[PDB]
Amino acid sequence: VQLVESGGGLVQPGGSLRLSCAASGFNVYSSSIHWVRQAPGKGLEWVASISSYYGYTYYADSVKGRFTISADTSKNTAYLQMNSLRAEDTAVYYCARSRQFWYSGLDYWGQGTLVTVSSASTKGPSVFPLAPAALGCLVKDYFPEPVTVSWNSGALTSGVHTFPAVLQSSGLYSLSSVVTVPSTYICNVNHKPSNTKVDKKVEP
Amino acid sequence: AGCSLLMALVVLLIVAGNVLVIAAIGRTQRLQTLTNLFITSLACADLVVGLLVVPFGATLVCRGTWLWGSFLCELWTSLDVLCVTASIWTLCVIAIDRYLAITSPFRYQSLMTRARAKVIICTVWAISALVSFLPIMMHWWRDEDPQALKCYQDPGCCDFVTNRAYAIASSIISFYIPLLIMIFVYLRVYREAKEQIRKIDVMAMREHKALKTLGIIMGVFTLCWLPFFLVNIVNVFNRDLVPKWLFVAFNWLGYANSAMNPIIYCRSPDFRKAFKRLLAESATTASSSLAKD
Amino acid sequence: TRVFKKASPNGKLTVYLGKRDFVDHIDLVDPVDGVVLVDPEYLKERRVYVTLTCAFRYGREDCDVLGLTFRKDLFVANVQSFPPAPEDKKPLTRLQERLIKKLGEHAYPFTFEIPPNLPCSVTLQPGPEDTGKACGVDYEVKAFCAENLEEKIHKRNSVRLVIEKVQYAPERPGPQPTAETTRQFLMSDKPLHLEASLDKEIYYHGEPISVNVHVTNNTNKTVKKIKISVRQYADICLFNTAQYKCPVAMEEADDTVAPSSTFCKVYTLTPFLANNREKRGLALDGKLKHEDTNLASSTLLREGANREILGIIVSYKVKVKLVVSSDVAVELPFTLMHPKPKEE
Amino acid sequence: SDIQMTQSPSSLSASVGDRVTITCRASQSVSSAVAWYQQKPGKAPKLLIYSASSLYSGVPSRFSGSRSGTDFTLTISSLQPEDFATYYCQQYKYVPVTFGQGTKVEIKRTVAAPSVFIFPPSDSQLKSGTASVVCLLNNFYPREAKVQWKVDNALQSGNSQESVTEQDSKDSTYSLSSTLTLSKADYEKHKVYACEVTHQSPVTKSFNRGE
Ligand SMILES: COc1ccc(C[C@@H](C)NC[C@H](O)c2ccc(O)c(NC=O)c2)cc1
């Protein structure tokens, strides 16, 4: 009744990873465990499935070979060993279940585990003010992209529009946080991976 | 008189039938069944006969002496007993398979495996070699009779002479024991087949065809091989009493079984279609939309 | 809704069967209702004949060296599809009536009533090296064209749309399986109680089975291992009643019970096919070639009826046996099948 | 081969208490085995309908599935504020199962003029060596708003990143940011940078490098 996945972290191209998925309320034999990845700003893409009742390991045409799906019956856990990683595999992998008797969609879905795949290493959130009836703060050259921009330590929450991180050709994320005001506007950028808190004052 | 044409006829028959059966079982994946591999060893055993045994045998008969080679005489003889013993045991094995299938079909599925059947024919070839090759290597089959010793000493002479002990041992282990197993297995199959037909009872025609099929495959085997081993039993007791020309005539009648086995044991429609092809459907289940109520 | 319409090789006959799987209620089996769309101009002399034959294939060969057919029709019914016969007229169901409306007068309906106490769609698992049609009971509505029934059924005009008579689990739960076997050794002269039991009798395919093995060994002898085997018994009564056993799940725990001591362990097992595919002769559920075949569903036989029934009748029983320095054994039966799909 | 599922519309606009319809056509003659899922931003997908005609237990009854051969359809009689999410269609009949492209559903409101703005690179960006100009489109609907760059009154079609913000629940309006990154040398070559917005006549705002 509950699927929890883990093991998704930053990995460089050509590395190795082991994504685990623990089940609770249903066994792995009565229901096949499926893995579906959804890239940021893209639709779902089936990765691979495991049918313990039949021992069938299905993989996608483009994903076959590099991926290896398995399932531990004693621990009712599923494993998706990943090798020869590529930049295209950057997506929010989801671990769902399918009724073995018989296949009826994917009833339960996991919360998801963001597994980013890029050669760029960790970097700091380089902030740059933006002023001319509105001000903004542009964060650039940072990976991954959990950045959270707050105006005046979250005091100015009106008119704020935090845009989503966009992947650049170099592999580093960037996003802009803009607030609207006709007419002293601190901008706090917090990056957890690098443990940095850049504070800048945006002015003309 | 000429022996080339009379011998060539049977030679072309065996080689042609066996090559056709082997090609049909190999090229066609549908024919590569479990019961077919048993006939593949029979056809393989019958092919070696028409290729090495029949040609050398025909020459020795009409020429009057064996001039191919001294050691080749024993080698050809040992290979002859090997193929015959293998062919007889193969006919008995497939008969047991049909019995295990007709009587206990559900047990036959798990008992008779493709890998197991391969081991069965391997053991058949093993026991046949132990009865044919092993005595030849040790010359246990060579008789101590004066005429027998003279023939063995003479490289040209290659007549098949065996002692009472080996002659009986070979006759009981090669033909009679499989014969008793074959006739008994087929009798039980015929009885069980009638019971199945009675329980089920186009229906009577197929039953008569199956009953007739069983009879022809058993009569051809008996009429061909029984005379050879029948006169051999008397030859063992009295070698000089029995004639040599008759022993050869009955031996050729036994080879006729291996010659007719390809066309007699592959009369099924699956094999006939493959033969016609060498000598030359199910529509997928779709679906339609029904107007909702 | 949708209707499965398999056509003949020539294409003249197309049988519109609303469903390829028919629920099997032991009280009243559902009817195999459909309509056959044929061209009135074609086969002006012949008559379209449909037959629902429950062919039990005991051999994996359509024909052999002897020529004997290795398939027995346990239940064969022949109804005249076209021209409609007054005696064979049946009340058209909602499915048949809708199909005739869409197809038109060219289509003629046909209905069947599978008698109860018959074998379900079960297929004997053919080994990986096996080559041929899978054995077991299989239902098929062969729609052919012939002036009479005894005439040779040409495959070009036949329509072999194989179906499956599946039996799901009952709405009411069964009684808690309980069985106790006490063995008294001559030398020991003391009882050895084995009060193993199951949590429930109806288990869904792939669902784990919890066997509460409660051993009370008072004899001087001690048990070396505890072996729980989910033995599948196929009661095949085609020609001679025979119970073929096949272990689908074995658990050999190295649990020792000292003398004059009690034991209690809930062993969790799961009958699955991934490991049993190597097993030869195993009875699997009868499904289509496209659909995956799972373990054969337990056939719910009619209470107070004939014990012997032609075809495959699979029955699952966990054999909790304890090996001693002879061995004790007790069989706890349970029904393994899928539940009735909820519809709304 | 792979049976790609073409789902439409790519972006459907609707209002609360309205009827919507999402179509999904299969490349091949897929059977009724076509599920429909609901994917909310951030949260995990949710199986709305299974078998294309049977609603999953625990989902609202407003959802409905109807098959018309190969063009499967998911219809919502009255969509609530919670029903504003992406929809996907997968064909679990043949493996490998292929999901849909997605159909983002957002709140429909009256068309409003876009608030276009331009912000050049601060002195810090110029010193870093990688300067970048940005154009902001605030309070505009629908999201289909095209932006064109003009470094020297010439259309640019390279090294430009576009970011769209999720429809805010306050005003149900979208926000767009187009960032053009250039080198310190090429940046000085161009004098006036302008952003042309085309969204429901086009407006062009320019700002010279030297103030
Ligand atoms: C006297 O003139 C001759 C000369 C040669 C032969 C051929 C013989 C080798 N074929 C033997 C046959 O191939 C065979 C088959 C199976 C057997 O067990 C035995 N052995 C009999 O003791 C023999 C026959 C008669």
CATH number at residue B40: 1.20.1070.10
- Between strands C327-336 and C314-324, the pairing is antiparallel
Name C27's Cβ contacts closer than 8 Å, sequence gap at least 6: C116
Flag whether B144 is in a domain.
yes
Query: What SS3 state is found at C108?
Result: strand
Do residues C88 and C198 share a domain?
Answer: no
CA distance A67 to A58: 10
Length of chain B: 293
Q: Which of B60, B77, B79, B80 to mutate to test the pocket of ligand 1 (most atoms within 8 A of CB)?
A: B80
Contact assignment for C2 to D32 by CB distance below 8 Å? yes
Contact between residue C49 and residue C149 where contact means Cβ atoms under 8 Å apart: yes
From B77, B81, B177, mutation site for ligand 1 pocket: most ligand atoms within 8 A of C-beta:
B81
Instruction: Report the residue of D134, D180, D208 to disrupt the A interface, i.e. the one with the largest count of A CBs within 10 Å.
Output: D134
- Tell me the residue type at C134: A
The three-class DSSP label of residue C85 is coil
- Known binding-site residues of B for cyanopindolol equal 80, 170, 251
Contact residues, chain D, for B286 at CB < 8 Å: 29
Residue A82: both structure tokens together: 């990943």
The answer to whether residues A93 and A35 touch, using CB atoms and an 8 Å cutoff, is: yes
Instruction: Nearest chain C residue to D65 by CA: give it.
Output: C1
Q: Is residue B250 part of a domain?
A: yes
Q: Residues of C218-227 as b/e, b for ≥16 C-beta within 10 angstroms?
A: ebeeebeebb
Q: State how far the alpha carbon of B199 is from the alpha carbons of C52, D89, D123, in Å.
A: 19, 54, 100
Q: How many CB atoms lie within 10 A of CB A151?
A: 24
User: Do residues C157 and C179 both lie within one domain?
Assistant: no
Contact between A55 and C275 using a beta-carbon 8 Å cutoff: yes
Nearest residue CA, atom 12 of ligand 1?
Answer: B81
Q: Which domains does chain D have, with CATH numbers?
A: 5-107 (2.60.40.10), 115-208 (2.60.40.10)
- Of C18, C58, C131, Cβ closest to residue B32: C131
Q: Do B287 and D67 touch (CB under 8 A)?
A: no
Ligand 1, residues at Cβ distance < 6 Å: B 57, 77, 80-81, 84-85, 159-160, 162, 167, 170-171, 174, 232, 244, 247-248, 251
How many Å is the Cα radius of gyration of chain D? 22
Three-class secondary structure assignment of chain B: CCCHHHHHHHHHHHHHHHHHHHHHHHHCCCCCCHHHHHHHHHHHHHHHHHHHHHHHHHHHHHHCCCCCCHHHHHHHHHHHHHHHHHHHHHHHHHHHHHHHHHCCHHHHHHHCCHHHHHHHHHHHHHHHHHHHHHHHHHCCCCCCCHHHHHHHHCCCCCCCCCCHHHHHHHHHHHHHHHHHHHHHHHHHHHHHHHHHHHHHCCHHHHHHHHHHHHHHHHHHHHHHHHHHHHHHHHHHHCCCCCCHHHHHHHHHHHHHHHHHHHHHHCCCHHHHHHHHHHHCCCCCCEEEECCCC
D130 exposed, middle or buried (CB, 10 Å; 0-12, 13-18, 19+)?
A: middle
Of A144, D91, A121, C65, the C-alpha closest to B271 is C65
C11 and C22 part of one domain = yes
Q: Which fold has domain A2-115?
A: Immunoglobulin-like (2.60.40)
Backbone angles phi, psi at B2, to 5 degrees: -120, 135
Structural domain ending residue among the three candidates C143, C172, C201: C172
> Long-range pairs for D144-147 at CB < 8 Å and ≥24 separation?
D144/D11, D144/D199, D145/D114, D145/D174, D145/D176, D145/D197, D145/D198, D145/D199, D146/D197, D146/D198, D146/D199, D147/D176, D147/D178, D147/D195, D147/D196, D147/D197, D147/D198
8 Å CB contact of B106 and C58:
yes
Query: Does residue C182 sit in the same domain as residue C160?
Result: no
Is there a single domain that holds both residue C188 and residue C60?
A: no
Write down the experimental method used for this entry.
cryo-EM
Compute, in angstroms, the gap from residue B4 CA to the centroid of ligand 1. Answer: 21
Both C150 and C8 in one domain: the answer is yes
Q: Which residues contact D85 (CB under 8 A, 6 or more apart)?
A: D38, D39, D40, D41, D104, D105
H or E element in which residue A83 lies = strand A77-83
Separation between Cα atoms, residue B82 and residue B49, nearest integer Å: 10
- Asked if A32 contacts A138 with a C-beta cutoff of 8 angstroms, the reply is no
End residue of a domain, out of C144, C172, C200: C172
Among protein residues, the one whose CA lies closest to atom 3 of ligand 1: B159
Number of domains in chain B: 1
Helix axis angle for B164-171 and B203-237, nearest 10°, is 170
d(CA C52, CA D100): 41
Of C148, C172, C196, which residue is a domain's last? C172
Instruction: Identify the CATH class of A126-202.
Output: mainly beta
- List Cβ neighbours of A136 (8 Å cut-off, separation of 6 or more): A129, A130, A176, A177, A178, A179, A202, D119, D134, D136
Q: Provide the 8-state DSSP code for D124.
A: H
Contact A115, A9 (CB under 8 A): yes
Spell out the alpha helix ranges (H) of D37-138: 123-128
Same domain, C167 and C181: no
User: How many structural domains compose chain C?
Assistant: 2
CA distance B9 to A176: 95
Chains that touch D (3 or more CB pairs under 8 A): A, B, C
> Does C187 carry a binding-site annotation?
no
Spatial separation of the C-alpha atoms in residues C87 and B153, rounded to whole Å: 88
SS3 content of chain C, % helix, strand, coil (to 5): 5, 45, 55
Closest Cα of chain A to C271: distance in Å? 8
- What's the burial of D158, exposed, middle or buried (CB within 10 Å: 0-12/13-18/19+)? exposed
Range of the domain at B142: 3-279
- The pair phi, psi for residue B20, each rounded to 5°, is -70, -45
Token duo for residue A17: 């990873």
Going by their DSSP bridges, the two strands C71-82 and C107-110 should be labelled as: unpaired
Place of tokens 């022949």: C78
Q: Using alpha carbons only, give the angle A115, D168, D160 rounded to the nearest 5 degrees.
A: 60
Domain that holds residue C260: 175-341
Q: Which residue of C has its CA nearest to A25?
A: C207
Residues C250 and C288 in one domain: yes
Question: Using the beta-carbon criterion (under 8 Å), do B32 and C4 form an inter-chain contact?
Answer: no
Say which amino acid occupies C62.
D
* Residue of C270, C284, C338 best to disrupt the A interface, most CBs of A under 10 A: C270
Looking at chain A, the domain(s) classified CATH 2.60.40.10 span 2-115, 126-202
Residue C289 among known ligand-binding residues: no
Instruction: Find the B46 Cα to ligand 1 centroid distance in Å.
Output: 16
**What resolution, expressed in A, was reported for this entry?**
3.3
- The Cα D98–Cα D84 span in angstroms is 23
